[PDB]
Amino acid sequence: ANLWERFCNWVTSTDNRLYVGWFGVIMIPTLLAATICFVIAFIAAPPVDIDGIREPVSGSLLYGNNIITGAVVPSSNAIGLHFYPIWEAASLDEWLYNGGPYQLIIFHFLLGASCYMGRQWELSYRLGMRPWICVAYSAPLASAFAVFLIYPIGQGSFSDGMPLGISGTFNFMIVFQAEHNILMHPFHQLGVAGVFGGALFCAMHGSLVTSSLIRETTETESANYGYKFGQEEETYNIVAAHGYFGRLIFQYASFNNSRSLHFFLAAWPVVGVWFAALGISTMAFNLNGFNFNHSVIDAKGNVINTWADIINRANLGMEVMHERNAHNFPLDLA
Amino acid sequence: KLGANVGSAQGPTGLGKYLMRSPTGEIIFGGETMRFWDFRGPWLEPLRGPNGLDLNKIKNDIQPWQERRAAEYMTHAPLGSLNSVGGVATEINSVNFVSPRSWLATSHFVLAFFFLVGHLWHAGRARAAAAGFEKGIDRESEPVLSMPSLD
Amino acid sequence: IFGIAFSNKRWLHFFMLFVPVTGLWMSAIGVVGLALNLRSYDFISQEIRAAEDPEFETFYTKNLLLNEGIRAWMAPQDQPHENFVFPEEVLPRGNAL
Amino acid sequence: MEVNQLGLIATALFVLVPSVFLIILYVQTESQQ
């Protein structure tokens, strides 16, 4: 057993309290870099010229932000998609002014999280598990990629990536609605069915399983003690739950197969969020939501407004007010 | 054409309204399009000198075919709705247009994504199948049971 | 993978009941507030600072500018009974757009 | 920043009172055989 072999054995060891693994070898330093930079920046970073018009936006706590308004601000529009590592700046002060921390953080993060996915596959393989938990995780991951990378690529600037902050997130959403009418995009709608449905089925599954717990406890103790970790027998009666839910709707709308049921629980929100992510990623190339603006016209040619047109009015408010100083020409083409 | 000195026109932000410098000094178009200064195209390059957009070429050498081209391309930006209403999302119905570039880019992003998913799926499955546990854990041989507790 | 894990199945499925149910109940409470316009609209400290200091900008003030746009541009058509006539000159707009 | 100064104590109590509650419950649970 030589040193490289020993190292490999420790890296891929199923005995480490937290699994490292080969993906972990990339994941750990990149996530640590992103995390440290993010915390420091969120607290103390000076204002950033996000839109490149020498109009710095304050994102850190020390500069007048609270938890809700604070953000790591996206790098400057003057940079566009240019790579802006620290060593491309003449000073740290420059780097900070132009929003370098955003780039450091999101590149390290996206890397680390991709490696998180890989690591999920990897431990599944060391443990003799089936491999696809990582595929589930591909849905939020893709989403992160959509808002931190793909959308900037399509719009030509990281300054249009999602800010790392709560209110910043809301800003990105509102502006996104203004420029792509995302609500009227079926992939966002599928996304909504994905997460609404996911929540519904979460509560559904939780409640049916809980409703059919086999009595193992007295009224003065938590029912949870009726289950003991590693016990071979099931802790609830799936036949009772099926009888109940099947009568709730009708028999053939209830699962009687736990495998196919749990598979459904997995598939619905995962597919939905895949579609949401694809929505963001395709609106990144300006294939936008349905446009029915002035779609309904009377016999003379008068515009008959629909709810689509009201939505358009709101969208117009957003469009005309957003980045109020950054546009010189009449069309906002990116 | 209306008489503006585009070179010295200060925009509302203090940056030039028409022209400004890139972060490395090249003379570039201003406004939001500052982000797009890496763009090169046959209609724009004649206005380009060693330091970027050349102001004397701008003042004297812009040909009508360039104006035409710029107007055409500006009014055929790859923006449009899913039902092929061209323009920004707030544009009214009138112009039946979605750019081929959008069609192609979006289609192939979607395809590429799902093919990455398919790669994860089949690579993981292939590993599991080769090692012999793609159908599930052997009850009498459950690996984790032969491992020490984490704590 | 993650540091912690479920070990109790009953607790797991109860938790799956608990999370979305509680979330929906919370949103419900907020909307009951909005019935009275009892909003979480502003941060007063932010507004005092921004009123005094025209170089102070946050994503919070940015979003307020967006809200102001939404109101001004959608109100007349969205609330026809009010008969809002907003001349072009009073509409809030950034440069060019 | 002109924050509401009561925020401080409001936050402090918000954290301390329920947390302490839990801690009491936990410790006397451990001290049982």
């Binding site: 309290r17 607290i43 706590l61 020390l62 609270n66 938890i67 003991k228 970790f229 590693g230 016990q231 | 507790s149 984490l150 704590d151 | 540091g3 912690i4 894990a5 070990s7 | 920043m1 924050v3 100064q5 925020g7 401080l8 936050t11 954290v15």
Partner: peptide
């Protein structure tokens, strides 16, 4: 004051992560 408060709460949460992970009740098979 607010900043100190925010960072304090945050720091407590990170400390809590540490304990919940490394000083957890061990899952014991029965």
């Amino acid at each position: 004051m607010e900043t100190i408060t925010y960072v304090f709460i945050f720091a407590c949460i990170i400390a809590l992560f540490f304990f919940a992970i490394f000083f957890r009740e061990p899952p014991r098979i029965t």
